[PDB]
Enzyme design. Structure first.
Site, PDB file in Angstrom:
ATOM      1  N   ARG A   2     -33.283  -8.485   6.631  1.00 34.01           N
ATOM      2  CA  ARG A   2     -33.684  -7.104   6.796  1.00 34.01           C
ATOM      3  C   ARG A   2     -34.706  -6.846   5.752  1.00 34.01           C
ATOM      4  O   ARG A   2     -34.570  -7.351   4.652  1.00 34.01           O
ATOM      5  CB  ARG A   2     -32.563  -6.153   6.535  1.00 34.01           C
ATOM      6  CG  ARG A   2     -31.415  -6.401   7.469  1.00 34.01           C
ATOM      7  CD  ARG A   2     -30.471  -5.218   7.437  1.00 34.01           C
ATOM      8  NE  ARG A   2     -29.270  -5.439   8.229  1.00 34.01           N
ATOM      9  CZ  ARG A   2     -28.478  -4.448   8.597  1.00 34.01           C
ATOM     10  NH1 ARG A   2     -28.766  -3.199   8.233  1.00 34.01           N
ATOM     11  NH2 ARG A   2     -27.428  -4.697   9.393  1.00 34.01           N
ATOM     12  N   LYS A  42       0.797  -1.229   0.000  1.00 34.05           N
ATOM     13  CA  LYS A  42       0.000   0.000   0.000  1.00 34.05           C
ATOM     14  C   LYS A  42       0.838   1.292   0.000  1.00 34.05           C
ATOM     15  O   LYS A  42       1.895   1.409   0.640  1.00 34.05           O
ATOM     16  CB  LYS A  42      -1.154  -0.043   1.041  1.00 34.05           C
ATOM     17  CG  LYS A  42      -2.528  -0.305   0.401  1.00 34.05           C
ATOM     18  CD  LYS A  42      -3.709  -0.414   1.375  1.00 34.05           C
ATOM     19  CE  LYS A  42      -5.078  -0.528   0.684  1.00 34.05           C
ATOM     20  NZ  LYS A  42      -6.060   0.507   1.089  1.00 34.05           N
ATOM     21  N   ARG A  46     -22.055   1.134  19.952  1.00 30.21           N
ATOM     22  CA  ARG A  46     -23.494   1.207  20.083  1.00 30.21           C
ATOM     23  C   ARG A  46     -24.085  -0.189  19.857  1.00 30.21           C
ATOM     24  O   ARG A  46     -23.382  -1.118  19.504  1.00 30.21           O
ATOM     25  CB  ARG A  46     -24.011   2.062  18.924  1.00 30.21           C
ATOM     26  CG  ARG A  46     -23.557   1.480  17.569  1.00 30.21           C
ATOM     27  CD  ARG A  46     -24.058   2.252  16.358  1.00 30.21           C
ATOM     28  NE  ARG A  46     -23.565   1.887  15.021  1.00 30.21           N
ATOM     29  CZ  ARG A  46     -23.953   0.839  14.261  1.00 30.21           C
ATOM     30  NH1 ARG A  46     -24.731  -0.131  14.795  1.00 30.21           N
ATOM     31  NH2 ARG A  46     -23.443   0.696  13.056  1.00 30.21           N
ATOM     32  N   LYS A  50     -25.227  -4.758   4.984  1.00 32.15           N
ATOM     33  CA  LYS A  50     -25.768  -6.057   5.436  1.00 32.15           C
ATOM     34  C   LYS A  50     -27.198  -6.339   5.003  1.00 32.15           C
ATOM     35  O   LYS A  50     -28.091  -5.492   5.073  1.00 32.15           O
ATOM     36  CB  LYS A  50     -25.675  -6.197   6.922  1.00 32.15           C
ATOM     37  CG  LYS A  50     -24.300  -5.779   7.425  1.00 32.15           C
ATOM     38  CD  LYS A  50     -24.220  -5.648   8.931  1.00 32.15           C
ATOM     39  CE  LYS A  50     -22.791  -5.531   9.455  1.00 32.15           C
ATOM     40  NZ  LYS A  50     -22.727  -5.444  10.942  1.00 32.15           N
ATOM     41  N   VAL A  79     -28.238  -3.102  14.481  1.00 31.17           N
ATOM     42  CA  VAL A  79     -29.510  -3.491  13.921  1.00 31.17           C
ATOM     43  C   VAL A  79     -29.773  -4.997  14.193  1.00 31.17           C
ATOM     44  O   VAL A  79     -30.880  -5.416  14.569  1.00 31.17           O
ATOM     45  CB  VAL A  79     -29.429  -3.267  12.407  1.00 31.17           C
ATOM     46  CG1 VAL A  79     -30.605  -3.853  11.664  1.00 31.17           C
ATOM     47  CG2 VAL A  79     -29.343  -1.807  12.023  1.00 31.17           C
ATOM     48  N   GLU A 122     -13.259  -3.186  13.014  1.00 33.23           N
ATOM     49  CA  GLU A 122     -13.806  -2.058  13.756  1.00 33.23           C
ATOM     50  C   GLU A 122     -14.718  -2.447  14.856  1.00 33.23           C
ATOM     51  O   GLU A 122     -15.182  -3.563  14.907  1.00 33.23           O
ATOM     52  CB  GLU A 122     -14.510  -0.972  12.931  1.00 33.23           C
ATOM     53  CG  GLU A 122     -15.766  -1.404  12.192  1.00 33.23           C
ATOM     54  CD  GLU A 122     -16.242  -0.257  11.367  1.00 33.23           C
ATOM     55  OE1 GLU A 122     -16.688   0.746  11.891  1.00 33.23           O
ATOM     56  OE2 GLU A 122     -16.080  -0.436  10.063  1.00 33.23           O
ATOM     57  N   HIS A 136     -21.487  -3.202   0.548  1.00 36.04           N
ATOM     58  CA  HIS A 136     -20.967  -3.068   1.892  1.00 36.04           C
ATOM     59  C   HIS A 136     -22.040  -2.841   2.942  1.00 36.04           C
ATOM     60  O   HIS A 136     -21.743  -2.421   4.050  1.00 36.04           O
ATOM     61  CB  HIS A 136     -19.866  -1.977   1.950  1.00 36.04           C
ATOM     62  CG  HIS A 136     -18.699  -2.377   1.096  1.00 36.04           C
ATOM     63  ND1 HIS A 136     -17.715  -3.219   1.610  1.00 36.04           N
ATOM     64  CD2 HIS A 136     -18.450  -2.187  -0.220  1.00 36.04           C
ATOM     65  CE1 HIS A 136     -16.858  -3.443   0.611  1.00 36.04           C
ATOM     66  NE2 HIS A 136     -17.270  -2.846  -0.492  1.00 36.04           N
ATOM     67  N   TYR A 143      -3.005  -9.859   2.513  1.00 37.45           N
ATOM     68  CA  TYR A 143      -4.174  -9.872   1.643  1.00 37.45           C
ATOM     69  C   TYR A 143      -5.257 -10.882   2.085  1.00 37.45           C
ATOM     70  O   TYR A 143      -4.976 -12.072   2.284  1.00 37.45           O
ATOM     71  CB  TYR A 143      -3.752 -10.085   0.134  1.00 37.45           C
ATOM     72  CG  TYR A 143      -4.889  -9.876  -0.872  1.00 37.45           C
ATOM     73  CD1 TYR A 143      -5.741  -8.766  -0.791  1.00 37.45           C
ATOM     74  CD2 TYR A 143      -5.164 -10.817  -1.865  1.00 37.45           C
ATOM     75  CE1 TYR A 143      -6.795  -8.553  -1.685  1.00 37.45           C
ATOM     76  CE2 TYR A 143      -6.208 -10.616  -2.779  1.00 37.45           C
ATOM     77  CZ  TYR A 143      -7.029  -9.490  -2.697  1.00 37.45           C
ATOM     78  OH  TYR A 143      -8.062  -9.331  -3.598  1.00 37.45           O
TER      79      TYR A 143
END
EC number: 6.3.4.14
Lengths: 433, 424
Positions: free
Chosen positions: A325, A159, A279, A225, A282, A275, A223, A190
């Site tokens: 969903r 990179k 919080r 869900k 969903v 990440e 990206h 990778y």
């Protein structure tokens, strides 16, 4: 326990929260946009306050309006829900500076996990597995550069068509070539075909933290869900312990408080941190079904200063759950498709859970997102769960708008999805995206 | 599994069975009356067959018609459901004989249990706790039995001691039996395969009644200990064996003072069954089908674990202040949702509740870790439920959930009638 709270969000989640409050004997204030007058939870709350015009920026995003609403009603805490100000450190700080309780982590903490660097860095220290690579920049010496690559394992990247090194022969060239693209480089491992497995945690602020198995959210489109399930297929009690305990520890070292999620990349039995969502998510219901824990109430207890009710030993994975969903969107653009719902029929039965605020004659507004509900079916095995979902979707009726139902159905019917373990690219792939 | 089946029923219980079929990969055949054309499950079935005009007498009860339906469709089995031909020996007899599979026990068994006497007898062979009595002008002996019985007693007048013996007996004369002043209604759930295996699935409490009709049901039953649970279960399981039971069934008892007194056995699936699925996680219906396909018992007793607590509020279309059925058109409908909330019903907005059949249109089931959680969920749940265009039970159910005495647990078969002031 908490006297009254402000539900700082709308739709689905808002409704989820209300129910949880009611159950706990907690008074509810519902802040809404002039456009969300007809929302179900609004209609069901104890108190109501229209904070501003339609547009989010002028309503759901208006801190001041939000805060005051709390002052007038004489509310003690505020529940951000997910996705609005949920992860906005100011708001958080502000709420507290204002004399109210923030149902979530400390602003500090939010800031911390807010930037990859500190986050990763924090993660590293805590022993959370991150994507391997070259600590500093990548130098001139091919002997050690290539030793790095061994260390981390091909394939790797450094990179213009994008380029992936699969062995030594190509190393040197790709490396130089990239430096040339300036007129200072790095090598990252990778992850070709990984799965998306995230870990669910709870922390009391007083030293206790707990993991509650995982969720697979590999089925994504742009990206975003689409389907979520728990537990994650292929995951072993041992692998689950390993990353769960690492996760809790981290929580501890960071002064985490509330519910949070750690998102990882999973490839070849290995985890790699992506990440932390500071919080609730969903997809939480999927986890509730499986452990039998009510994430929302638990979040409410913590806020009240109650410590963790549950011990890790009392957490038990039972059965399997799937979530679809449901959205009102353009099949091609994927954009919300607002309108009035002429006819609605929810599905029922054993192992069937419907989380939505919609109703017949209810009008879906164009100012917000496209998600109108979630359907969660539980079962003793994956298969049962999938079968229930198949049916449930068949029973589900929503007229007057364009939905996503068809695709979900099509996914439940997918050969590979039923086989399980698909990756983050399968979906777009099968769609032609 | 079985290929195709006939759902020899309607409404609520028909849709519950449909769903269980689908999951298993079984084709469905739905027989309906000309007045149930629009039924939910009817709209969802693989195949449909009109069996007659509205009056059950001519439709749901029209045996021959039902049988023919299975014929033309090529169906293999028949699911009687509850409260129709479900406990009809003839029906079971004819089904089988016409070469089909009856999803239920054996006709023999249905008769055997369909007789107040025959049953008691059998129950006494298996060793199931039955109501003590005279078992068959003397004031000497006659008193000693009663001692054996325990007071109070009733001559079939109520006796509390030797004194009132004579006077009461002399007025009666112008059988002696145990007197259960304040009992609860406790029933035990079982599953047997006919291949020698039998399992009990804890109990349920249905003390909450009106006109002898169940209003609210719960599981497990409050005050019931494991020790007791076992004692009775083992007892009921054992009998399943002696009698050669095959399928799902329930043993209903009166409970008073730590004792159970047999009342009856519904040789069938019951309305309230859902309350048990939640607490043990067993799909009662699927097992039924399973046993009917010749499979053995899937579960083992040790595998039966009771977790949490569940409550069931039956929802009917009646006038809550008169209890008069309330056929009509539902113009507005909204079902409750959430964690631990289960809605079982065929109704839908725009749907017309007919006057011909029974008044129950739905069941609302809530679950929790505790009985307190479940009740709390019920309350919210009822608050969310919307049924417009007809008179309902709602408000009453709400009132029950708020009853201080209900929140405490342990009520008796008489509380409700009392609370309402119907005992007069």
């Amino acid at each position: 326990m908490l006297d009254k709270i402000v539900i700082a969000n709308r739709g689905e989640i808002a409704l989820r929260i209300l129910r949880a409050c009611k159950e706990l004997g907690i008074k509810t204030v519902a802040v809404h946009s002039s456009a969300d007058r007809d929302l179900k939870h609004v209609l069901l709350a104890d108190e109501t306050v229209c904070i501003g015009p339609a547009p989010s920026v002028k309503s759901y995003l208006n801190i001041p309006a939000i805060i005051s609403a709390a002052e007038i009603t004489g509310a003690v805490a505020i529940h951000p829900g997910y996705g609005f100000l949920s992860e906005n450190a100011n708001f958080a700080e502000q709420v507290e500076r204002s004399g109210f309780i923030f149902i979530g982590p400390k602003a500090e903490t939010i800031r911390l996990m807010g930037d990859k660097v500190s986050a990763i860095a924090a993660m590293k220290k805590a022993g959370v597995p991150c994507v391997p690579g070259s600590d500093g920049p990548l130098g001139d010496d091919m002997d050690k550069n290539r030793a790095i690559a061994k260390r981390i394992g091909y394939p790797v990247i450094i990179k213009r068509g994008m380029r992936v090194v699969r062995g030594d022969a190509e190393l040197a060239q790709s490396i130089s070539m990239t430096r040339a693209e300036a007129k200072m480089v790095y090598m990252e491992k990778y992850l070709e075909n990984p799965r998306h497995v995230e870990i669910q945690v709870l922390a009391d602020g007083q030293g206790n933290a707990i993991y509650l198995a995982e969720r697979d959210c590999s089925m994504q489109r742009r990206h975003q869900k689409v389907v979520e399930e728990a537990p994650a297929p292929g995951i072993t009690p041992e692998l689950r312990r390993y990353i769960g305990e690492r996760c809790a520890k981290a929580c501890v070292d960071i002064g985490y408080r509330g519910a949070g999620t750690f998102e990882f990349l999973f490839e070849n039995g290995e985890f790699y941190f992506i990440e932390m969502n500071t919080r609730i998510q969903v997809e939480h219901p999927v986890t509730e079904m499986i452990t039998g824990v009510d994430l929302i109430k638990e979040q409410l207890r913590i806020a009240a200063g109650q410590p963790l009710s549950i011990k890790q030993e009392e957490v038990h994975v039972r059965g399997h759950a799937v979530e679809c969903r449901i959205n009102a969107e353009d099949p091609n653009t994927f954009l919300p498709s607002p309108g009035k719902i002429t006819r609605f029929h929810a599905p029922g039965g054993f192992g069937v859970r419907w989380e939505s605020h919609i109703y017949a004659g209810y009008t879906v507004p164009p100012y917000y997102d496209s998600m109108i509900g979630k359907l969660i079916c539980y079962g003793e095995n994956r298969d049962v769960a999938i079968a229930r979902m198949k049916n449930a979707l068949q029973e589900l009726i929503i007229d007057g708008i364009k939905t996503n139902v068809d695709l979900q159905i099509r996914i439940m019917n997918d050969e590979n999805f039923q086989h399980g373990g698909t990756n983050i690219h399968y979906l777009e792939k099968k769609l032609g995206l």
